[PDB]
C-alpha cells in the first residue's frame, strides 16, 4: 500500500533478506533486476526451475531463517514496464550513482520511494542529482545495512547465511516528515532490528558504521599488504598486529577521522554521533568490565587519550564473542576469524580488488572531495586515501598496468561532490 | 672464591644452580633438605650412586650436565663449619625460618649467603636473624633466572631446564662486594646477564612477579577460577571473560606500581620503567603495537596513557607475535596457561597453588614493612582483602578442618618490623 510493487535493484546477499522482510510485511509484486553477467545467468536459471530465495539464521539468529518468492526476474532493463512503486537498491554503495544513472526512467514514473540500502555521507544528495527533471520519488538513506548476509554458495545464488543482526540502524528521508519511514521500521523489525527514524538523510548517513570502520582499519598498511598478496597468508580483518590490522595507531586514525567526519555533519546541519556508544550498542556490545557504561555514555567529552584505549578496549574484547557460551577449558568463539579477502584475476584475466577496500576507498574519496565544498581539508582522512593509492600503485608497478582492471586506476570524485554540492544548495 | 657450597632446598632450582656452580668451579658440594617424603627419595637415589642431574631443553641441550653430591643433610644441627658459600633454594617465604633455624654460632666459616628469588626487604630479614658479630655477606637476586622442573619424583635429583631468562639482577648487602662479580660469572654461564645494582633492595624490586601477579592473580575472578573444583579453569593471561585482564586489573597494576616505586625511593633504590621491563625483561612486541619512545617514556606519560600503553602490552601477546604464522595467518597461542587449582593434598587437605598464594605472601609483607615508611598502600591492600575474603569463603564452604593451615590468616608485622629495625641499624 505504502510499498505496492517492489522492484529490488542488485539481487545479491542484501538483497535476498530485504526480500524475506519485505514478503513478511506484504510486497505486492516482488521483482529484481540485475545487470547481465554469470550471476544473473545462474539467478534466471534457478528462477526457471522453480526456485525461491531462501534465507538462513545461523546460530541464535536461526529463528528469522524462511523463503521468500520472487514474481519477476529481470537482467534486461528494456522489459521494465512502470509496474513498480518502490525501488530498493541493493548494489554496492559505490555504484549507487552508476545504478541509478542507467535505470530506465522513462518507463518508471510511477516510483515514489527510492531505499538506499547502505547509505554514505551525501549519497542521498547524489541519487537526487541524477534523477530526471520532475522526478516524483523520495529517496531514503538507511545509515547501514542491519545485519551480516552472505551468499554461501554462488552456485546457489538464491540461498544467503545472515550471521548477525545489528541491534539499531537510522532512516532518513528527503521528504521532510516522510511517512514512508515507519513503513521501514516495520519492514526491518520483523528480523529484530529497530530502525530510528531522522530528520534529515544526511543524519542517517553520519550513522553509517563502514565509513567510520572500514576507513581506518582496511586502507591501512597492514590490511592492503594482505588484499594486495597472492602467496602468503590473508590474515584476519578483526584482529590485531599481526595477526590483523587493529593497532594503537589504526585506533587514532578512527578517532581522528570520527572527529572529521563529525565536523562535516555539523556543516550540513546534521548532529554527530558518540562512536563508542553507536558501536557498543547499535551494533555489538561487551561486558560492563570491559566497556562501563559511564564511560560508553562519557565517551565524547573523554580526552582523546581515553577515547582512542576504549576504542581499542573494544575491539581486543570482541576477538571472541563475549556472549558465547564456553567451552570446557573456558575458551568462547573466535568471532575475528574472518579472514581478508583477496586480489583474484576475473573472466578476462584482470586483476580485480575486493570490495573490502575498493568500495571503501570510493566512498572515503567522494566524502573527502565533498568535504572541501565545505572548506574541510579532512587531514586523517586524506592520509588514508594516500595510503591505499600508494599501495595499489605499487601492486600495479610490480603486476603490470596491462594485468590490471581499470578500477584500479586513479578516480576523480571531484565531478560527484559537485554535483552533491549542488543538489545541497538547491 | 666459592669454596664449599652448601645448597640450602635441594629441589629444581638447586640442580641448574650445583650444575652452573660446577661449570665454574667450585669445592666440595653440599645439600640441606628438611625432612619429608622428597628427602626419603634422595637419601635413597644418593644411596644407589645417584648424582644431580640436569638435561637442557631443545637450544638449552648443552646445559644438560651431571655433578656429584659430596654431602646430604637433612638437619641443620648436624652442620660442620665447612661452609663457604650458603645458596637458599627454597621457596623465599622460607628463608626466614631457615636462616633463624641453622647453627650460625658454629657456622662462622660462612662468608656468602646468596638469595635465589629475594621480595623487597628479603636482604635485610635475613640480616636481622644473624647472630651480631655474623660476617656472611648477604646477596640478593632479582629473581630465578630459568625455568627448571623435576620430572619424575621417583629420579628426584633430574631436572630439566626449558628455558633461561635473559636478565636478573644482583645486590648485596656489602658495598661495591666482590662475591658479586664471582655470581655474576657463575650465573653467566647459563645464558642469563646478571646486572649489579648497588643495593640489594634495587635489585628485590626488578622481578616480574611483584609487579603483574598482584594485580592479575589476586582480583576477584582469579580467586574465583583457583577456588572452583569444577568448571573451566579458565586461563591466566587473557582478556575477560576467558582470563582475568581488563581495563580495571590494568589500573591496579598501574597504580600498585606506583605504590612500589615510592616504597622503593624511600628504602633508597631506583624504581623500575614498568613498561620497559615488561618489555625487556619478560618479553617483546612489535614496534607497530609498542613504539619505542612510548616504552622509554612510559614513566613520564600520563596516568591514562600509561594504562592504555599497559593494555596493549596484554593484548598484543594474546599470541606470540614472533611466532611462526600457520597457514590462514594465525600464532602461536601463548596466552592459554590455564588456572592451576586448588588440589587436596596427601593428608586430604585443600591446598592453594605456589600462585597465588606466593604472591599474596610477599605482598602481605610489603604493605606491612611499607607501613613503618609512612606508606598506606591502599592499592595492595586491596588486593589483600580480595584474596582474604575469596579464602574466607572457601574455607567456611569446605570446612577449616578439611583445609591446610597455610590458607588460614597470617601475621606479617613481626617480620616487617625486624626488616625496619635492620633498616635503621
Ligand atoms: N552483505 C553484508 O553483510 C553487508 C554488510 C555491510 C555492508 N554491505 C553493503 O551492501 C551492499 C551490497 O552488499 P551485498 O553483500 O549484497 O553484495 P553482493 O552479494 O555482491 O550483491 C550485489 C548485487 O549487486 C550486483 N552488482 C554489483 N556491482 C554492481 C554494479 N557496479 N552495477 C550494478 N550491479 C552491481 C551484483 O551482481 P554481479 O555480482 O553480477 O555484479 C549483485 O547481484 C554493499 O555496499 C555492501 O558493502 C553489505
Ligand atoms: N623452578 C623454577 O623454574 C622457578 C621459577 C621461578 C621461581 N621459582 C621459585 O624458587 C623457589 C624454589 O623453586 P623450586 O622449583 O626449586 O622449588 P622445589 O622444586 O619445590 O624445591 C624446593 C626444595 O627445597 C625443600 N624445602 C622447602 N622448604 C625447605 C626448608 N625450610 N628447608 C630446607 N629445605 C626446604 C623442598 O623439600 P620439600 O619438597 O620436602 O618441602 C625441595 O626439595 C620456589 O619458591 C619457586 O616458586 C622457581
Not at 584475466?349 to 574519496?365: I, M, Q, S
Request: net charge neutral.
Amino acid at each position: 500500500e505504502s510499498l505496492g510493487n517492489v522492484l529490488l535493484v542488485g539481487l545479491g546477499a542484501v538483497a535476498i533478506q530485504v526480500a524475506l522482510d519485505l514478503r513478511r510485511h506484504g510486497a505486492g509484486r516482488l521483482g529484481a533486476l540485475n545487470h547481465p553477467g554469470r550471476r544473473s545467468q545462474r539467478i534466471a536459471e534457478a528462477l526457471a526451475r522453480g526456485a525461491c530465495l531462501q534465507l538462513e539464521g545461523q546460530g541464535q539468529h536461526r529463528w528469522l531463517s524462511g523463503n521468500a518468492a520472487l514474481d519477476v526476474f529481470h537482467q534486461d532493463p528494456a522489459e521494465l514496464r512502470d509496474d513498480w512503486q518502490t525501488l530498493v537498491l541493493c548494489v554496492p554503495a559505490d555504484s549507487y550513482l552508476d545504478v541509478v544513472r542507467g535505470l530506465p526512467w522513462e518507463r518508471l514514473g510511477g516510483v515514489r520511494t527510492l531505499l538506499l540500502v547502505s547509505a554514505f555521507i551525501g549519497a542521498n544528495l547524489l541519487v537526487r542529482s541524477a534523477l530526471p527533471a520532475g522526478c516524483q520519488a523520495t529517496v531514503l538513506s538507511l545509515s547501514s545495512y542491519y545485519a551480516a548476509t552472505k551468499v554461501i554458495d554462488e552456485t546457489q545464488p538464491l540461498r544467503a547465511l545472515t550471521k548477525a543482526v545489528k541491534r539499531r540502524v537510522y532512516l532518513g528521508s528527503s521528504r521532510p516528515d516522510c511517512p514512508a519511514r515507519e513503513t521501514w521500521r516495520r519492514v526491518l523489525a520483523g528480523s529484530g532490528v529497530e530502525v530510528v527514524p531522522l530528520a534529515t538523510p544526511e543524519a542517517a548517513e553520519g550513522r553509517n558504521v563502514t565509513t567510520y570502520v572500514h576507513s581506518p582499519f582496511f586502507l591501512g598498511e597492514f590490511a592492503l599488504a594482505r588484499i594486495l598478496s597472492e602467496q602468503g597468508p590473508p590474515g584476519f580483518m578483526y584482529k590485531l598486529y599481526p595477526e590483523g590490522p587493529i593497532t594503537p595507531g589504526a585506533i587514532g586514525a578512527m578517532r581522528r577521522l570520527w572527529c572529521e567526519l563529525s565536523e562535516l555533519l555539523r556543516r550540513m546541519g546534521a548532529e554527530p554521533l558518540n562512536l563508542l556508544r553507536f558501536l557498543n550498542d547499535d551494533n555489538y556490545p561487551v561486558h560492563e568490565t570491559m566497556l562501563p557504561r559511564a564511560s560508553i555514555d562519557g565517551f565524547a567529552e573523554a580526552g582523546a587519550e581515553r577515547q582512542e584505549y576504549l576504542l581499542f578496549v573494544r575491539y581486543a574484547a570482541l576477538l571472541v564473542d563475549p556472549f558465547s557460551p564456553a567451552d570446557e577449558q573456558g575458551r568462547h568463539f573466535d568471532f575475528s576469524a574472518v579472514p581478508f579477502r583477496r586480489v583474484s584475476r576475473d573472466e578476462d584475466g584482470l586483476w580485480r580488488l575486493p570490495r573490502v577496500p575498493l568500495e571503501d576507498y570510493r566512498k572515503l574519496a567522494l566524502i573527502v572531495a565533498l568535504a572541501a565544498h565545505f572548506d574541510l581539508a579532512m587531514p586523517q582522512a586524506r592520509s588514508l586515501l594516500a595510503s591505499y593509492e600508494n599501495a595499489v600503485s605499487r601492486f600495479i608497478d610490480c603486476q603490470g598496468a596491462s594485468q590490471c582492471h581499470p578500477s584500479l586506476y586513479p578516480i576523480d570524485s571531484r565531478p560527484a561532490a559537485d554535483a552533491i554540492y549542488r543538489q545541497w544548495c538547491s
